[PDB]
Ligand binder design. Structure first.
Ligand SMILES: [Mn+2]
Length: 566
DNA sequence: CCTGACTCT
DNA sequence: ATGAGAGTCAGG
């Protein structure tokens, strides 16, 4: 716990070396337009703390931040890059990101501060952020010397840990995955988040007014059918109405009481009309609470834009997630919810939304990895396995994905409301047709037991230390992760590479088009209307060619005046 | 704060 | 026991 540094009052030349650990500290969880509270730089010449007022208004320091040839090692460089964009400053030359390095080494550690990453290498001359800032209502930036010491210690830790982290990544064959995939993607995600998506608030507000009226009507109908007023949004009060007052069968219980899951209620429709109304009510109520009210709460009023954060170091499989707001779960399944997407519009007049989605991506990946000749030929014939297995097609999608990822006879039976005996026979016939898939799934489970981890196409890893558990439930869930993770994660790898390849192609061709969102196997862009034709060729080609498998990748695309129309 | 609901891939 | 990966919401 002994570390010297300069608490600097001005930027000096020796701070601007061509290699440095850099900390640009943003304490708020949502870093969009958030205060930068302090800066630290550690390099060959020493350790320095700078006040952002000073540093960020200094033309040489701003120039250095933006100079790609001056290399910066950081932790969560996207947070810094976006926070700096909101300050009108461009950040370039990030050559190492400890957050992403830690994530690739082991996603289960849930590393989300420098101290947590440092623990992976038994480095402890740095405190956890939470210890320094405090939690909840007590959260605060400490006195300058305390803050300064913390930021310097974090920079010093990044400085010392780069080599040990790079060496372990290299040993895992994950060095390129970091340097050539995740780090380049980080800068692309920063651009998307800062761009944001424009919202039609007039439209959304009108939808909200009309939805409130409809909710009230459905609500009263439910009370009439029930013979009583109650809170429909309380599974507890609802369970009393359904299973005590109305005396409906109890199909399922949870730890806290009667289940009122949508699966259960749907099965209760032969007994009472009220369950279909309740299902409808809870759909409408989610639309209003989340996609009208919740969405309007996060719209920046002056620009009418929403700015999501794509968490790149969270999911256990290599996927992204999207928060505040989540723009990866906007309704589409039912027309009533899908209408929400009419409120998502282009950020300029005479621009349009373009959306492209990989078809059956995880099934194509699986064909390649499992080397199932039958499935592999299906895709070479450009057939549609979803339609072949076949609302029908949508319901058949869940069956295909259910079956390959280990659904049981009980689960398939409950899903299709068919006989458990019949469900079992359908699963047996399915593997009959795709014997390579069955073989693969048996083999990957055994491999996970032997190695302790599974891997994706671009060498992403997930450790599965529970997979030999003597406990049936613990073991079985781990085995199913062994079946699913390599495929979901390989599909993640591919779309990440496609985003990188696509941005480069957009720059080369000097298009104004740019990415707005990624939704797991879909890419959403906006562009001038004149660029649509080019996009129809470019976007799908770049996506389809991101990797070369034993089967072709296929990408569907559409464009229009709103996201709904795309 | 956790649970169980609805939302997506 | 009973495909897997996510986030937000109201209720309690
Ligand atoms: Mn798709």
């Amino acid at each position: 716990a002994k570390m010297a540094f300069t608490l600097a009052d001005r930027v000096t030349e020796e701070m601007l070396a061509d290699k440095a650990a850099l900390v640009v500290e943003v304490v708020e969880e949502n870093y969009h337009d958030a205060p930068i509270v302090g800066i630290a730089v550690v390099n060959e010449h020493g350790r320095f703390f700078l006040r952002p007022e000073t540093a960020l208004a200094d033309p040489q320091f701003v120039a250095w931040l933006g100079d790609e040839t001056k290399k910066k090692s950081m932790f969560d460089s996207k947070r810094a890059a976006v926070a700096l964009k909101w300050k009108g400053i461009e950040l370039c030359g990030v050559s190492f990101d400890l957050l992403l390095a830690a994530y690739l080494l082991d996603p289960a550690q849930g590393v989300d501060d420098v101290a947590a990453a440092a623990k992976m290498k038994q480095y402890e001359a740095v405190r956890p952020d939470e210890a320094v800032y405090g939690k909840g209502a007590k959260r605060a930036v400490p006195d300058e010397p305390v803050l300064a010491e913390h930021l310097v210690r974090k920079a010093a830790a990044i400085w010392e840990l780069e080599r040990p982290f790079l060496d372990e990544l290299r040993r895992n064959e994950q060095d390129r995955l970091l340097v050539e995939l995740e780090q380049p993607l980080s800068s692309i995600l920063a651009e998307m988040e800062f761009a944001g998506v424009k919202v039609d608030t007039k439209r959304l507000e009108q939808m909200g007014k009309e939805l409130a009226e409809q909710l009230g009507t459905v609500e009263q109908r439910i009370y009439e059918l029930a013979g009583q007023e109650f809170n429909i949004n309380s599974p507890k009060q609802l369970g009393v109405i359904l299973f005590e007052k109305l005396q409906l069968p109890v199909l399922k219980k949870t730890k806290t009481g009667y289940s009122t899951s949508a699966d259960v209620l749907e099965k209760l429709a032969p007994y009472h009309e009220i369950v279909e109304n309740i299902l409808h009510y809870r759909q409408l109520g989610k639309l209003q609470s989340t996609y009208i009210e919740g969405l309007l709460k996060v719209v920046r009023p002056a620009t009418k834009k929403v700015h999501t954060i794509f968490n790149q170091a969270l999911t256990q499989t290599g996927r992204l997630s999207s928060t505040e707001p989540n723009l990866q779960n906007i309704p589409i399944r039912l027309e009533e919810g899908r209408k929400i997407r009419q409120a998502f519009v282009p950020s300029e007049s005479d621009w349009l939304i373009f959306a492209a989605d990989y078809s059956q991506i995880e099934l194509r990946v699986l064909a390649h990895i499992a080397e199932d000749d039958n499935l592999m030929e299906a895709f070479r014939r450009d057939l549609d396995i979803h339609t072949k297995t076949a609302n029908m097609r949508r319901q058949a999608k869940a069956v295909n994905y259910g079956i390959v990822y280990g659904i049981s006879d009980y689960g398939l039976a409950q899903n299709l409301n068919i006989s458990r005996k019949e469900a079992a026979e359908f699963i047996e016939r399915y593997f009959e047709s795709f014997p390579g898939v069955k073989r693969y799934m048996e083999n990957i489970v055994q491999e996970a037991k032997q190695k302790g981890y599974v891997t994706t196409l671009l060498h992403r890893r997930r450790y599965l230390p529970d997979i030999t558990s003597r406990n049936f439930n613990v073991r079985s869930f781990a085995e199913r992760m062994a079946m699913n993770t390599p495929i979901q994660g390989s599909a993640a790898d591919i779309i990440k590479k496609a985003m990188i390849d696509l941005n480069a192609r957009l720059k080369e061709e000097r298009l104004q088009a740019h990415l707005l969102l990624q939704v797991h196997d879909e890419l959403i862009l906006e562009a001038p209307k004149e660029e649509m034709e080019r996009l129809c060729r470019l976007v799908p080609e770049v996506m389809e060619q991101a990797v070369t498998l034993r089967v072709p990748l296929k990408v569907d695309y559409h464009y229009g005046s709103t996201w709904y129309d795309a």
